[PDB]
Each structure stands twice: as structure tokens, then as C-alpha cells.
């Protein structure tokens, strides 16, 4: 029972600290950025067998060459994507080009902490900051493939391999020794599914998990259920070796 | 009840305000500042406490001058002291636009007076915890005023507030008996430096700085400027002679 601008004794806002804890309360989103492409994946976490695979979509498309995933509460994610596509597609009209991935992350993260009650100097109406974590990926003609993370605190870092949600601790440390600069696009697909299989309740299938891909030519592409099932069958052969 | 000291507009059972009283304690936690009023003009002086050797000498000006005829010195929170001059700067610009000739000293006191009064009437804002001393040479004679956090002010022959308020301002009473007929503007500069060192007994634990500025019709002729050159160093040796 206080204002959203009240600082904690640690020097932080109460709205910022409790928003980071809502990330683990939702699903787990894992992705890896390589030199040949960025492999992103999410977990639908179906609570009932009657849930359709096309129901929950945690991977949207901001641009043909730029894509992102969501985790946790998806209520705040849909609002950010509307502003993310606004700061992107409209930016194409201004400069007649594609917006930078790092520049697009700044415009999206700046809309988090602008909330308040009766903000002086201008009109800002927001009840609470966004409690959703977004992993921003894309490709450009200069820096190359990059994978960022949009935090509710307004800060962003460039991660080569990042695991958010419930896998922000156990599944995050497993990607330290399994990542390498020479990792290709095909080997990265089996590496993500290898982590998603161990962190999932039941067996890994196309209904409980959805993966995407971002390349230079094809751009943002979502793996088909038949394409995903072929990668899962190849994963079982990699689990049993010696 | 409980919580009368929480918000602003809530009165105390004896008819006073706690937030106004709490703002007075914030005035005595800052650097002290004094003032001297004469017939030709007024003299401003402030003692700036130096924290460490990282401070650059004489590159910091605490006194914010309103137009050419009004200097302003404050003792208290630095952010709250600059907002009063910035508000008075717009009042002086709005006055000279419609009213032509610059605003006199007793007229400029009403702009800062009512503006602080509005902060005590709202629960969404807080009163200023800084005491600003302003003055100069008006169209007729001269005047000096000291704005208190409560908004109460009057004409002052001298004004001092800060850590040395109990000391420096107590020495102003001896200045009246010393020159009951009148005091020149040049002699008031040397007397202002001595008052700083008389109240320095509590400031001896840190490093100090002397900044003196005066305005009158005898020399500057309606120009408020800081003391520089050999005039500032001359007042230091005369003040430190009795110390």
C-alpha cells in the first residue's frame, strides 16, 4: 500500500523488484545466438490435453529479419509487441531502412519505467511496469546476429545463450560449457531441444514446445510440427551413445 | 490522534505545523550565510564549507543574482535554494516586461513570499527547507529581507542563518551599537569577513571559503557583483588580525 515511485531501502523501486520475480512464475524460454543464425524456443506448458497447439503463441514476429520470444505472464507481452512493431515498422518509413536490433531494444525498454501517478512535465498513464521478459533477436548488415534480453527494470544485455523463466538458474548454468563460438545452425537446434527435454515434465513433442529460427536469407521462420518432430527423433539418437 | 506530523496541511492540536518545524532544522544543517544592510546598499557574505581538497577554488558561486539589482544567498538544501531563484527569475522577467523599470527590493519579497505559501497549502508538495536571504538597492533607499521556510519575513538590518546562526547573527547586534548613525559600504565588506571568522569556531573542523558580494549606489551604482582583486584579500587580513 504505497506509491509506485517509492524506493526500497536497497535503493530500488518496489515495482521493479517484484516484477523480476514474476518471470520464474511462468514458462521457460531458451534461445541461443550463433554466427549462422539465432535459434529461439519456448514452452507452452499445456495444463490439459485438450489445449490446441495453435492456442498459446510465445514467439511473435516484429520484422522479417527480427524476432523475439516471451516468457512468464503474456498479458504484458502483447502490449509491448504492439509498441515494438510500432517503433520498428514506422522507423522503416522514416529512414527507408531496417531498424537496428540494439536500437529497437532501447525504444521498447524505455516504455517500462515511465509509469507513475500524476507524472509532472507530460502525460504518462500506466498502472504497473511490464512484468514480462522478452528476448530480442535479429540480424543486421554490420554487427550480425544478436540476442538481447528486455528486463522489466529497463536494462538489456546481449546474450549468446540465454535461458529465462523457470530455467533462469538451473538451465542457465548448463549453457556455459555447452556453448562455443563455432556452433553451427544445425547443431544449435539439437542443443536447445536437449535442454528443453530435461526441463519438461512429460516427454518432448511438438505440442508442448515451439521453436523458431532467424537467418539472413529466410529471416524469421517458425519450425513446422513435422519439422520439429524430425529434430526430436534425431535427439533421441544423440541421448544414447555410449 | 496519530500522524499529525506526516503530511503538510494537517494542523497540530496547538495550531502549528510539524512539517514547517522540520524544515527549520534542515536550514541549520547547511552552510551559514550572513548579511549587512547600509544606507547606500547591502552586503552579502557566505561561508562555503570545503569537504575535501578536490574542490576547485573560487570556481563555485553559491549566490544567484536576480537581474543586476538583486543578489540571493541561501542556507539550507542546495536543490531547494536554486528553485526559489529560478522562480523569482521568471517573476523579475515577467515584471520588467509589463512594468518596464526593474522590480524594487520590497516588491520582489512578495513574489517569493506567496510562492512558498502555496507549497504549505497542498499535500502533494512540500515546503522549502531552505532560508534564502535576498536584497539590493531599490528605487528609494535600500531594503533587506530573509525568507524563512514558513514564509514569514520582514525588513532586516541584518540576516544570518546556518550552523553559525547562534554566533554570527549574535554579533550583528554589536554592529548596530558600533555605527548607530550609519555604515559605509566599503567598511561593511571588512566587517562581513570578521563575522564569518567569529562564527568559525564551530567550522574549524573543516575547510572554509569566503565569498562576499555587495551592491550600492556609491561605486557599482546598481550593480550586484562579487568582490575580486586585492579588495577581497585586504578584508581577509583585517578580519584575521583580530582572530
Amino acid at each position: 500500500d504505497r506509491g509506485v515511485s517509492t524506493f526500497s531501502p536497497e535503493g530500488r523501486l518496489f515495482q521493479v523488484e517484484y516484477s523480476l520475480e514474476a518471470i520464474k512464475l511462468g514458462s521457460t524460454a531458451i534461445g541461443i545466438a550463433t554466427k549462422e543464425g539465432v535459434v529461439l524456443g519456448v514452452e507452452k506448458r499445456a495444463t490439459s490435453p485438450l489445449l490446441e497447439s495453435d492456442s498459446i503463441e510465445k514467439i511473435v514476429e516484429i520484422d522479417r529479419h527480427i524476432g523475439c520470444a516471451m516468457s512468464g505472464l503474456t498479458a504484458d507481452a502483447r502490449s509491448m509487441i504492439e509498441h515494438a512493431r510500432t517503433a520498428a515498422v514506422t522507423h522503416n518509413l522514416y529512414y527507408d531502412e531496417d531498424i537496428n536490433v540494439e536500437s529497437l531494444t532501447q525504444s521498447v525498454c524505455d516504455l517500462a519505467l515511465r509509469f507513475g501517478e500524476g507524472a509532472s512535465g507530460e502525460e504518462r498513464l500506466m498502472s504497473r511496469p511490464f512484468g514480462v521478459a522478452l528476448l530480442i533477436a535479429g540480424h543486421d548488415a554490420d554487427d550480425g546476429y544478436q540476442l538481447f534480453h528486455a528486463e522489466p527494470s529497463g536494462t538489456f544485455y546481449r546474450y549468446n545463450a540465454k535461458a529465462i523463466g523457470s530455467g533462469s538458474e538451473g538451465a542457465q548454468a548448463e549453457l556455459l560449457n555447452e556453448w562455443h563460438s563455432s556452433l553451427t545452425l544445425k547443431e544449435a537446434e539439437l542443443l536447445v531441444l536437449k535442454i528443453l527435454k530435461q526441463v519438461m515434465e512429460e516427454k518432448l513433442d511438438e505440442n508442448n514446445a515451439q521453436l523458431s529460427c532467424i537467418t539472413k536469407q529466410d529471416g524469421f521462420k517458425i519450425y513446422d510440427n513435422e519439422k520439429t518432430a524430425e529434430l526430436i527423433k534425431e535427439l533421441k539418437e544423440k541421448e544414447a551413445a555410449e | 490522534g496519530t500522524g499529525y506530523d506526516l503530511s503538510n496541511s494537517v494542523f497540530s492540536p496547538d495550531g502549528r505545523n510539524f512539517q514547517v518545524e522540520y524544515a527549520v532544522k534542515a536550514v541549520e544543517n547547511g552552510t551559514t550565510s550572513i548579511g549587512i544592510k547600509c544606507n547606500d546598499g547591502v552586503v552579502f557574505a557566505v561561508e562555503k564549507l570545503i569537504t575535501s581538497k578536490l574542490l576547485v577554488p573560487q570556481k563555485n558561486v553559491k549566490i544567484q543574482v536576480v537581474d543586476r539589482h538583486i543578489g540571493c544567498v541561501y542556507s539550507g538544501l542546495i536543490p531547494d535554494g536554486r528553485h526559489l531563484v529560478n522562480r523569482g527569475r521568471e517573476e523579475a522577467a515577467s515584471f520588467k516586461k509589463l512594468y518596464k523599470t526593474p522590480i524594487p527590493i520590497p516588491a520582489f519579497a512578495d513574489r517569493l513570499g506567496q510562492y512558498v505559501q502555496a507549497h504549505t497549502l497542498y499535500n502533494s508538495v512540500r515546503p522549502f527547507g531552505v532560508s534564502t536571504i535576498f536584497g539590493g538597492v531599490d528605487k528609494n533607499g535600500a531594503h533587506l529581507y530573509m525568507l524563512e521556510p514558513s514564509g514569514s519575513y520582514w525588513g532586516y538590518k541584518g540576516a544570518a542563518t546556518g550552523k553559525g546562526r547562534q554566533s554570527a547573527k549574535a554579533e550583528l547586534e554589536k554592529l548596530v551599537d558600533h555605527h548607530p548613525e550609519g555604515l559605509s559600504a566599503r567598511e561593511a565588506v571588512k566587517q562581513a569577513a570578521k563575522i564569518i571568522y567569529l562564527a568559525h569556531e564551530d567550522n574549524k573542523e573543516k575547510d572554509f571559503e569566503l565569498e562576499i558580494s555587495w551592491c550600492s549606489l556609491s561605486e557599482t551604482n546598481g550593480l550586484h557583483k562579487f568582490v575580486k582583486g586585492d579588495l577581497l584579500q585586504e578584508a581577509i587580513d583585517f578580519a584575521q588580525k583580530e582572530i
Binding site: 512464475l25 490439459s48 489445449l51 503474456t74 502483447r78 500524476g118 500506466m126 512484468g131 | -
Partner: protein, 241 residues
């Protein structure tokens, strides 16, 4: 107006204005519905405590947003009128702006998207009602059944129920109904909804309202005598089996 925020993150990471709003749906009338291949059926109950309620003058529990799609909610009736009116205006606004008939997918994300605003808008409170949008897209016979939660999360379901005694009906729809082989006839879709209402309505007639959704903008509302016809056939095969 009122600029003070309401929804605040709990120290556990949740929101009080959300979870406490979900209890209003669980205390309301249960709304269950299923979808077949060629048809979609949305059942709804009423309050059995109040009597002397004329069915004709009483507004239907299933609100029709468009000719090809309707809305049957469960929850606070005070917050439902706000969603029904704003969804129908957007239905005509979409026909004005894009000159296209609305789709069930666009209607669900709009209503769920509007609910995301009030949760994020300081000075207002989230809706305490959950709506079920079911219909058919233009030039498409594929059934579309979408759930809209008060928190703003929407999803598609073959058979889903909300309201009181929801977990009892959900466990009944998983074993009895199969999503891989849905019924291709309208009569089997109506009898399936009645079987789910036997454990909630608990031997009642005038308190049951079933709405049949058919493609090509065809809506046939079952009357009081038509609903009891399917109830009798099921009760004869229930106790005897």
C-alpha cells in the same frame, strides 16, 4: 479523474487485483461449451434461487456479437456489459475501416487486448468476468472456440468450461470427449453439453440455456421444450446403464 493505480505486484510476483478478480468467475454461473466439425454448441445455466423470471423479457445469457459469432461469458454481470458493447462497436468499426467481416481470432485478441489495457491503465480495475467466444470465420467451416481470461491470456480449446464446479466438468470432458474424433453431427454436440450440465444444474429445466452456432451466419436458439427433449433421452440411458 482518478489517477491512482490499483493493480500492484505482490511480493510473490502475482497481482492482487487479478487473483482476487478470478474468484468472481468461480462464484458465478457455470458456462460450458463444445465444438464439433460442422457445428459449435455453447451451453449456459442461470440462477436457480430466483424465480418468477420471464424468459422472453430477460436478456439472453449468450450475447451475439456478430451474425457468425456469439459470446457466452461467466462472471460479474456489471463488467460484462462493458465488453459486449465495445466488442460490437469494433465489429462494425472493423467493417468500416478494413471493409472486411470480423474473424473469431481477431475478436478474441481484441477483447483480450482491451482487458490488457485496464490492467495496465492506472485508475481502472480489471474485468471480473471471463468470456467465451465461439463462431465461424467468413468462408470457413472450421470451428473456432477461444477462451478469454480476466488476466488477458487467451487460448483455443476443444471443450472447456468456466464458473462454479469447473474442475468437475473439465475432468468429465477429457475422458468422455476426444479431441481427435469430434462429432460431425449437431445432435451429438447438443447431447454432449447436456451431460456436462447434469452435475451442476442438478435437475432443472428453465435454468438451462443452450445456443447452437452454425456456419453461414446461422444461429438457432433451443427453446425450453427443445432443451428438455435431449434431457429425457440422456436420463433414460443414464440410470439404465
Amino acid at each position: 479523474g482518478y489517477d491512482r493505480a490499483l493493480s500492484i505486484f505482490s511480493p510473490d510476483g502475482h497481482i492482487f487485483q487479478v487473483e482476487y478478480a478470478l474468484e468472481a468467475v468461480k462464484r458465478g454461473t457455470c458456462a460450458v461449451g463444445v465444438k464439433g466439425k460442422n457445428c459449435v454448441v455453447l451451453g449456459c445455466e442461470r440462477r436457480s434461487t430466483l424465480k418468477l423470471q420471464d424468459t422472453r423479457i430477460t436478456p439472453s445469457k449468450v450475447s451475439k456479437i456478430d451474425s457468425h459469432v456469439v459470446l457466452s461469458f461467466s462472471g460479474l454481470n456489471a463488467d460484462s456489459r462493458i465488453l459486449i458493447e465495445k466488442a460490437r462497436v469494433e465489429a462494425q468499426s472493423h467493417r468500416l475501416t478494413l471493409e472486411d467481416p470480423v474473424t473469431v481470432e481477431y475478436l478474441t485478441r481484441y477483447v483480450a487486448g482491451v482487458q490488457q489495457r485496464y490492467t495496465q491503465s492506472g485508475g481502472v480495475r480489471p474485468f471480473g468476468v471471463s468470456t467465451l467466444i465461439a463462431g465461424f470465420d467468413p468462408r470457413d467451416d472450421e470451428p473456432k472456440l477461444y477462451q478469454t481470461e480476466p488476466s488477458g491470456i487467451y487460448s483455443s480449446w476443444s471443450a472447456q468450461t468456466i464458473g462454479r464446479n469447473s474442475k468437475t466438468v473439465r475432468e468429465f470432458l477429457e475422458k468422455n470427449y476426444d479431441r481427435k474424433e469430434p462429432p460431425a453431427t449437431v445432435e451429438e454436440c447438443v447431447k454432449l453439453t447436456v451431460r456436462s450440465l447434469l452435475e451442476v444444474v442438478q435437475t432443472g429445466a428453465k435454468n438451462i440455456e443452450i445456443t447452437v452456432v452454425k456456419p453461414d451466419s446461422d444461429i438457432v436458439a433451443l427453446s425450453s421444450e427443445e432443451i428438455n427433449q435431449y434431457v429425457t433421452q440422456i436420463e433414460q440411458e443414464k440410470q439404465e446403464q
